Amino acid sequence: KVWLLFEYPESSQAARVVAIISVFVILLSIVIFCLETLPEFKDPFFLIETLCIIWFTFELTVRFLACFCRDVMNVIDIIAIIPYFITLATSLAILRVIRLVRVFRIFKLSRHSKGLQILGRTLKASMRELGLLIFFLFIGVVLFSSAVYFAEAGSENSFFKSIPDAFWWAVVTMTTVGYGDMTPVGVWGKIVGSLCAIAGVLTIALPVPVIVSNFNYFYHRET
Amino acid sequence: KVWLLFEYPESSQAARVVAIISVFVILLSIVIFCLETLPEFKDPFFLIETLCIIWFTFELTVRFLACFCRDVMNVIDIIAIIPYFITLATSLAILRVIRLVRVFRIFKLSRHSKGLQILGRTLKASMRELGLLIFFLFIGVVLFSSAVYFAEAGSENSFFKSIPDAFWWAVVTMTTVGYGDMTPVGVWGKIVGSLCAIAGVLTIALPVPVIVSNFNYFYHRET
Amino acid sequence: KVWLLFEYPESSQAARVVAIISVFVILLSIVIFCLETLPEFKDPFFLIETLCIIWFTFELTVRFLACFCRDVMNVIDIIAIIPYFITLATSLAILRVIRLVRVFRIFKLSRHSKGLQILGRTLKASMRELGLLIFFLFIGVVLFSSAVYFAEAGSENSFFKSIPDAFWWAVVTMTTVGYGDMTPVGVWGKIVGSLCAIAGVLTIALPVPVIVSNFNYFYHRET
Amino acid sequence: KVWLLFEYPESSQAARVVAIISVFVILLSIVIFCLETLPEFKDPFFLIETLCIIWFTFELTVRFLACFCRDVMNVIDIIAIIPYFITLATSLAILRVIRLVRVFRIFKLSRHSKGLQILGRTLKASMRELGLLIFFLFIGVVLFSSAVYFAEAGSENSFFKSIPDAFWWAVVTMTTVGYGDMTPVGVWGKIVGSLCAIAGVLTIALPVPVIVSNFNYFYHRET
Ligand SMILES: [K+]
Ligand SMILES: [K+]
Ligand SMILES: [K+]
Ligand SMILES: [K+]
């Protein structure tokens, strides 16, 4: 009865309109999540979150009754609804952590969108390449964060006060973001940074064409 | 009679020279558009814009009489001529908006150039990929603009005063531009930015090879 | 007699050693060109440049006598020797211009190196793509330098005082260098910059795979 | 006897567990290397390095007795153990140089990891491309570091005081890192930088697809 309505968006006009509200409520909740942090708004933002939560719970229980937890879609629905009920029952770090989780509302759009599902499949099918990329980046960062520290220990006015403190700079230079908050001053540090830029470029460039190929294959096969 | 002259640049020497003036007037109008904003120039810039407008109107009406509005080329011609007649007839935001539209003179070069037409066709044939890229970038930005805000709410001297205020930073880091006007200060914010750089690199890298392939196909087929 | 010695580096051991001095003198001249500008050195740098010039003139005249000007290699040799004789015969802008030309000594290494010759051939065979890239970059820069100026004319403390003054910023953002000396301040300027980054990324990405393919073809065919 | 245990990680459960300690000790030594530079720690860090050194010496001598130096793996083991014995026997520049070498502990993970071995093989098989890339980058840097100096010698407040001093800026701009500590001020310097950005982009882009192809071939053949 309701399973066809909530699982066949193209079966009938009654089911087609339902998905529109399903997307509108998600977008409204996402919008209202960001506006609570604006200083100008330091009651109206709670009576609408309550309706959004009620709609999410109804949408979950309708498909829960008419059968489940082995797929990723149902897991996301449960996570999106938990944080509201926790704060109704009732350390600041725990409060910030449970407030941050609310951001997982954006992942409920994956049931409607197809490109996001393709991206998820591509991410699932390319774990080894991502691990290799992280490994190479860590090796390069730890290799380049010590040379720049040892090549500028003579100067009393150097930003790099320790090897860990030079980690940030390294990941800034290898990714070519270049914020510029920390820069080498001596000649040897400049040579180290010049080598670091090229090494980071090559390290980032090497793994990507495999993930790109997997995404292209999935996108072309699905569409 | 005049249709062959104004639509066959290689038919005769009389038609070939006409296109030269057609390009020279466009370039002169583009040049004169920028120089009105220089502080040194705070009359000479109006009596030449009038001649440019007269030439544009003549060029439009010659092909309008000898036949139309279903193509994009004729639409651009109408837009390029409207703003002059509006200000002759006679709120500051409306004035700035109608002054900004004048910049559409540069698109009249598409009738003469071929690579710009190829670029337009490629843009037309790859709407879905551009939409997917924008979707992925928005998802990543909204995902990373809240973690960095929640990981630095303890510090009283943090730049990120709200989740929307951290949008800019995010799009600066994911695109690897790295202006450096806003940077994370705490350890957790630095970890968030380190993850954000890689995520933005991958997100930007994934969609492009399809638009690149479409442009290559169009460029090779046309030329 | 001398033509075989000066044109067959692998014919004999006598000719093989000659090229070593030919490279050493070029490298020494390049090194001595940069060190004259160091503040510490504000006579020794002239008596060695004289010997370098004498060797260049001898190397030119040996192959000039035993035959010519239709190739690019002989043109570079003449340019490298002219600036010394001009200053011996005897407005500050002309002096700086004729002093800057001396930097063309580095191009004499193209006769010995092969990868540089391959790069030159690739550059010669891909003029149209470079022109198209420059055209697209100019169009994007002129398009984005006016919107950011018109979207921030209200603020009295904006860096962008004119449309030309916003050219620099634009080419900084489209190339993703991001120096950070000029940044948008208002919301609309930030949106304009966010669009500009993506537009520049796509514009730069589109033309390159043709020049890359030409270079790969030449490199694989030669080697 | 012990050769099978120390060279066949998958032969038996006794050999499988040994590699776990071999990785744990390496990771612990790497971690303890960085924490000595933290200002908070200005004895505990020596009695654990001693155990790490003892384990490394034992692991080396077990495979040394049961046979050698022609491979790269055995060379790395010797280098990792030398610096400890040098300081036990007993100019500040020599001390910093011999302290910096300790960072070579990270390369001992290559015996266990496979992707790092693939990366090493790819680096070995692509020496010519790396040399060509370095050559092109040096040519571009020396070409662009003199034009920007000669185009801004008129201004008394220019950062570029000499041609060598402008090397850093150049390698910052060609790699698109853009720290922003040194920027051109005059119009001509800005034009030079605008050309430099594009030239560096093309120069970096040209060599890479060969190293990428070699890495892809090795990764697909091995796995
Ligand atoms: K950058
Ligand atoms: K960059
Ligand atoms: K930057
Ligand atoms: K910067």
From Swiss-Prot, chains A, B, C, D:
Result for mutant: residue 198 to V: In RNA edited version
Signal peptide: none
Motif Selectivity filter location, chain numbering: 176-181
Known outcome of mutating residue 37 to I: In mns; flies display reduced sleep
Membrane-crossing residue ranges in chain numbering: 14-35, 45-66, 73-90, 92-112, 128-149, 191-219
Function field: Voltage-gated potassium channel that mediates transmembrane potassium transport in excitable membranes. The channel alternates between opened and closed conformations in response to the voltage difference across the membrane. Forms rapidly inactivating tetrameric potassium-selective channels through which potassium ions pass in accordance with their electrochemical gradient and may contribute to A-type currents. Plays a role in the regulation of sleep need or efficiency. Plays a role in sexual behavior, where it is important for male sex discrimination.
Subunit and partners: Homotetramer or heterotetramer of potassium channel proteins. Interacts with qvr/quiver/sleepless (via loop 2 of the three-fingered Ly-6 domain); this interaction may stabilize both components of the complex and may be required for targeting to or retention of Sh/shaker in neural cell projections.
Protein name: Potassium voltage-gated channel protein Shaker
Species for this entry: Drosophila melanogaster
Residues of the whole record sequence present: 212 to 489 of 655
